[PDB]
Write a protein that binds this ligand. Structure first.
Ligand SMILES: O=c1ccn([C@@H]2O[C@H](COP(=O)(O)OP(=O)(O)O)[C@@H](O)[C@H]2O)c(=O)[nH]1
Ligand SMILES: OC[C@H]1O[C@@H](O)[C@H](O)[C@@H](O)[C@@H]1O
Length: 426
């Protein structure tokens, strides 16, 4: 039996993503171990995973910016990783973008090392060519502001739309990102949670045979109260608003969205978290819950978004453009309004709006605050306008081209099968 070791970077988000890949490789006959470096209870995750997928093993390495402590942990983890790999060398190693230091270990032991890139191919291209651009300027991306950055196969990118940890060149975390992007070029191959029919130009631009190959296997996709509420509403009539894992708005900004949602007159399901420093009556405009009881439902902190997006009553998604939320909207054919917030979401927004044309922006996301007028305008536009009809049509195409890529013979199933064979023969 051929054995694969998958190495996510610390963080429940990275672990959940990498586990989805572990279940696939296992499905197709590989013997999978996931390496854990600890920074929402890893222990509970390992217990549930072992009960549901016993063939996937876990190995927890002993302990030696918000990404900055992760980067230190990973570096000081190379000795423990080395030893576990010396015990039983595997046929192949699968790394996270943040796990570049492990390429030291994988080269010494002559182990084929693949990256699992959990964002799209457009982002990979930007991340591939960032060190090049770094040598060609002295300015910070923050100093450059709206000056466009030109990377292969993707729209121009305003330099302040680069990821927040990369905005100030005079910081150690900037240097680590430069470091991880360079080491991208030492890979055997790139496994990407995208499908080729979604980002053709991007997939072409990186398949230049002066770079490792790449395999497009996605979309890889990962309570009772609001699902009930949705049942009681007509088909395609609800606007779903949900802003990722940590997303946070100020009470002032929450008041603008409330006013805009109310004046749009549309039905809504809105996930609200505590502002950065949830008490809905203290935070929301007075009488807003009373007045909209009936048309809208506000849920605190967390919603079952995968189910919500699959529900037939949902007609639209105001999203922070995280890549898991974007793939889940596409697979269910839900048209989007793009309101990016942190990590690489601003970049994702550009690709979504101008390359894929699957969303329209929420103007003001780059300003101090999105206005009530704008929230109302785009909510109306999404659920009523002929432009909204045109957009659903492109989202409908995307749903079918995604579902097709995953069915037998489709382009994702064949890309999966192709890399499995290549690890078996490693
Ligand atoms: O209330 C919420 C918010 C998020 N999610 C899930 O959390 C993930 C968010 O991943 P994404 O990459 O979109 O955003 P990030 O984690 O970077 O905030 C997705 O699977 C969502 O469906 C969820 O289930 N409920
Ligand atoms: O592993 C996937 C993780 O990678 C990051 O690049 C994303 O911003 C997160 O949304 C995600 O949880």
């Amino acid at each position: 039996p051929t054995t694969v070791v998958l190495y996510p970077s610390p963080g429940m988000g990275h672990l959940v993503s990498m586990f989805e890949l572990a279940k696939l490789l296992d499905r197709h006959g590989l013997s999978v171990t996931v390496i854990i470096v600890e920074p929402g209870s890893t222990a509970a995750f390992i217990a549930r995973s072992s009960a549901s997928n016993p063939s996937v093993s876990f190995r927890v390495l002993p302990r030696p910016h918000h990404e900055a402590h992760a980067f230190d942990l990973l570096r000081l983890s190379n000795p423990e990783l080395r030893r576990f790999l010396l015990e039983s060398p595997p046929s192949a190693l699968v790394l996270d973008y943040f796990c570049g230091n492990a390429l030291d270990v994988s080269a010494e032991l002559r182990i084929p090392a693949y990256y699992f890139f959990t964002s799209g191919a457009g982002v990979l291209s930007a991340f591939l060519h960032f060190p090049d651009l770094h040598s060609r300027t002295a300015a910070s991306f923050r100093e450059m502001g709206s000056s466009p950055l030109h990377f292969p196969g993707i729209p121009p990118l305003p330099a302040d739309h680069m990821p927040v940890p990369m905005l100030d060149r005079d910081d150690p975390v900037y240097e680590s990102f430069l470091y991880f992007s360079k080491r991208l070029k030492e890979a055997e191959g790139y496994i990407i949670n995208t499908f080729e029919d979604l980002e053709p130009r991007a997939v072409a631009a990186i398949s230049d045979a002066a770079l490792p190959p790449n395999y497009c296997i996605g979309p890889l996709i990962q309570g009772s109260e609001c699902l009930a509420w949705l049942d009681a509403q007509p088909k395609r009539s609800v606007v779903f608003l949900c802003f990722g894992s940590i997303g946070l708005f100020s009470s002032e900004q929450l008041k603008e969205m409330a006013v805009g949602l109310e004046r749009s007159g549309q039905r809504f399901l809105w996930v609200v978290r505590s502002p950065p420093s949830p008490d809905l009556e203290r935070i929301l405009p007075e009488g807003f819950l009373e007045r909209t009881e009936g048309r809208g439902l506000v849920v605190k902190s967390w919603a079952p978004q995968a189910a919500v997006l699959e529900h037939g009553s949902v007609g639209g998604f105001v999203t922070h453009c995280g890549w898991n939320s974007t793939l889940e909207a596409i697979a269910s054919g839900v048209p989007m309004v793009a309101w990016p917030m942190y990590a690489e979401q601003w970049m994702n927004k550009v690709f979504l709006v101008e390359e894929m044309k699957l969303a329209v922006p929420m103007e003001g996301y780059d300003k101090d605050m999105v206005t009530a007028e704008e929230v109302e305008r785009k909510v109306r536009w999404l659920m009523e306008s002929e432009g909204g009809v045109e957009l659903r049509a492109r989202t409908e195409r995307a749903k079918e081209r995604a579902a097709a890529s995953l069915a037998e013979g489709g382009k994702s199933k064949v890309a999966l099968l192709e890399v499995v064979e290549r690890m078996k023969r490693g």
